[model samples]
Target: AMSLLEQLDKNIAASGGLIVSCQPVPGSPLDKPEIVAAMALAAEQAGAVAVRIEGIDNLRMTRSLVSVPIIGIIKRDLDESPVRITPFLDDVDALAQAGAAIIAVDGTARQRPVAVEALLARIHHHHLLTMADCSSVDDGLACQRLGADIIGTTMSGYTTPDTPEEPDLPLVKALHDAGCRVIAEGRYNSPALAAEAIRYGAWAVTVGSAITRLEHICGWYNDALKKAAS
Candidate 1:
């Protein structure tokens, strides 16, 4: 089996850049094995370097069918917490069992468990690479201290104490200084922003809804046109 780092490096070398998209599970009847398989295939055909998928069964099935790397995650809603990026170790274990090459977890300052570091250590014990999904420079540094293999700007404003609207250049620089692979992943709407992220020292960038969510894409264009006309 290829290590996660090795697989990512190979894709980067081949494509000159890596493209990852989030695979959201459709509600009701749309969320089936066949649909998931089709989505995975579409991502592959579109030249995606990897896919980040939630739900254990779907993730497992998708991994079996898709030849590209998959970052498996489980989204469990916790009533007590606002942080939704893989809430617990059980989620991590499920993803690992489902053959996720990279595991992502919330590295936010708020709503994290007291045993976060220990859990991270346990993830390392399983020999799976970790990507800390953080919203701030402090969170990124904390995750780095906990031994994260990669740092991701995935929780920009989702978790409380919201950071800036655009890419956090200072956080990006901080992560670069820490020597961990930086993945710019939130609110990236245009090719220009993606390029800027790479220029800011991101190892790669992941863009989702802006590219995949047609409604949001249309809304962005609509709003832009409306503002310009006004």
Candidate 2:
């Protein structure tokens, strides 16, 4: 929404207070353009400093509808890659035109549709912030080499399919200590966890379904305890 993400980077450098990346998932019952836009606008009013959203179409609609900073991702399942978040350079073109100030991409160690460096270069050519959603500390550092403006702890639980159900705060600190801008994300389901990410020196944090996905809330609420309950 023309939110000028470079200034947001300055906020990160200054260690600004709690900043939330609001992204209510699209394609769900509560995820139409109107509702996503409403949820995002409400999130900004509720004090979120920025927001993250995916897809070209959804972002185009939401970007026009809110003034909050929009971090855009386009999930395309390519035959050659398991990396889904804005995996190719072509995806960058569409999001840039759709008014996204930041672009989020998978920064995992595994092979991806487009190499991280190439993707970052293309996104930078368009003058948008690049958030590297990473699986490991190595991946974060690697993404930095490619000029990723932010390192997001997004693949914590599934990075190995065996990581503890934690938000990877230590990874956040590591990235911070190395002078990389870090955005804490992934499986931060509680206020304490989100706060903990901030406490660990993250530039910001992103939590979606916990706030916007009601049925997702119900699904997690319907936890294994459901099997244990009468």
lDDT of each: 0.74, 0.78
TM-score for each of the candidates: 0.86, 0.88
- Best candidate, TM-score: 2
Q: Write the per-residue lDDT of candidate 2 for residues 1-230, one digit (tens) a residue.
A: 42465667665455443344445545567667667667777777676767777776667777877776788888777787678888878899899999988888888878766788888888899988888888777888999888898888887666455768667889889999988888888878888998898889887888876887787788887886697896
Error of 2 at 86 (Å): 0.4
Model 2 residue 21 lDDT?
46
Error of model 2, residue 189, in angstroms: 0.5
Q: How well does candidate 1 match the true structure in TM-score terms?
A: 0.86
Range of the 10 consecutive residues with the lowest summed lDDT in candidate 2: 15-24
